[PDB]
From a paper:
The FimA subunits of the pilus rod are single domain proteins of 16 kDa with an incomplete, immunoglobulin (IG)2-like fold that lacks the C-terminal β-strand (G-strand). In the structure of the pilus rod, the FimA subunits interact via inter-molecular donor strand complementation, in which the N-terminal extension of each subunit, termed the donor strand, inserts as a β-strand into the preceding subunit and completes its IG-like fold. In 2010, Sukumaran et al. discovered that the FimA proteins from the enteroinvasive pathogens E. coli, Shigella flexneri, and Salmonella enterica have a second function besides formation of homopolymeric pilus rods; soluble forms of FimA, independent of FimC, act as inhibitors of host cell apoptosis after pathogen internalization by stabilizing the interaction between hexokinase and the voltage-dependent anion channel (VDAC) on the surface of mitochondria. We showed that all three FimA orthologues investigated (FimAECO, FimASHI, and FimASAL) were capable of folding to an alternative, self-complemented, monomeric form of only marginal thermodynamic stability that likely represents the FimA species that acts as an inhibitor of host cell apoptosis after internalization of the respective pathogen.
FimAECO, FimASHI, and FimASAL were produced as reduced, insoluble proteins in the E. coli cytoplasm without their N-terminal signal sequences. All proteins were refolded in the absence of the chaperone FimC under oxidizing conditions to allow the formation of the single, invariant structural disulfide bond. The purified proteins were crystallized, and their X-ray structures were determined at 1.5, 0.89, and 1.69 Å resolution, respectively. All FimA orthologues crystallized as self-complemented monomers, and all structures strongly resembled the previously reported NMR structure of the FimAECO monomer. Specifically, all three FimA monomers showed nearly identical immunoglobulin-like folds, completed by intramolecular donor strand insertion in a parallel orientation relative to the C-terminal F-strand. The global folds and registers of parallel donor strand insertion in the X-ray structures of FimASHI and FimASAL were the same as those observed in FimAECO, and all three structures showed high surface complementarity between donor strand and the rest of the folded FimA domain. The only significant difference in the mode of donor strand insertion was found for FimASAL, where Ser6 instead of Val5 occupied the P5 pocket, which caused a more extended conformation of the FimASAL donor strand segment Ser6–Gly7–Gly8. The overall pairwise Cα RMSD values for the three X-ray structures were 0.30 Å for FimAECO/FimASHI (113 Cα atoms), 0.51 Å for FimAECO/FimASAL (154 Cα atoms), and 0.57 Å for FimASAL/FimASHI (110 Cα atoms), and the only minor conformational differences were restricted to loop segments 15–20, 37–45, and 89–97, and residues 51 and 81.
Numbering used by the authors: 4 to 163
The structure:
């Protein structure tokens, strides 16, 4: 018996600015796999899947230029809960409904995906610095439907 599954990926891009730090070329164009989940196991508004880790790696940082770094995220927001990213599918596949994608900083704080809600400021050390995040699905309806649940977002660095 086939199973109904919801899952997909989120793709992140950012500007390559030679500011206080330089963003790794790997981090500035990356795809994070969120997993596949049994659709029937989403049974209530607010159900969430496991947090999937991803990183933004900064190279060649100079704390003398800027003591701290933070990140904001921008994408098309879910209409039911605008603190989540709306999900989409490829043309050959159906889109899941009743879920959005949540991004959290390393303090476990969700970030509104409006391009102006920045993560907790992190102290920089000379050279390479790792900024850690997670992503997951969050149900926006009690009854969800199966399919692909992908998103595209941009990230924005703030050095202070």
């Amino acid at each position: 018996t086939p199973v109904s599954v919801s899952g997909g990926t989120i793709h992140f891009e950012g500007k390559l600015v030679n500011a206080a730090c330089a963003v790794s070329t790997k981090s500035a164009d990356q795809t994070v796999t969120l997993g596949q989940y049994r659709t029937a196991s989403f049974t209530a508004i607010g159900d969430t899947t496991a947090q999937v880790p991803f990183s933004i790696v900064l190279n060649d940082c100079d704390p003398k230029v800027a003591a701290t770094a933070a990140v904001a995220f921008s994408g098309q927001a879910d209409n039911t809960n605008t603190n989540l990213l709306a999900v989409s599918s490829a043309d050959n596949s159906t889109t899941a409904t009743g879920v959005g994608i949540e991004i959290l900083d390393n303090t476990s704080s969700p970030l509104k995906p409006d391009g102006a809600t920045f993560s907790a400021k992190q102290a920089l050390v000379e050279g390479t610095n790792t900024l850690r995040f997670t992503a997951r699905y969050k149900a926006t309806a009690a009854a969800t439907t199966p399919g692909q649940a992908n998103a595209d977002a941009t990230f924005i660095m703030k050095y202070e």
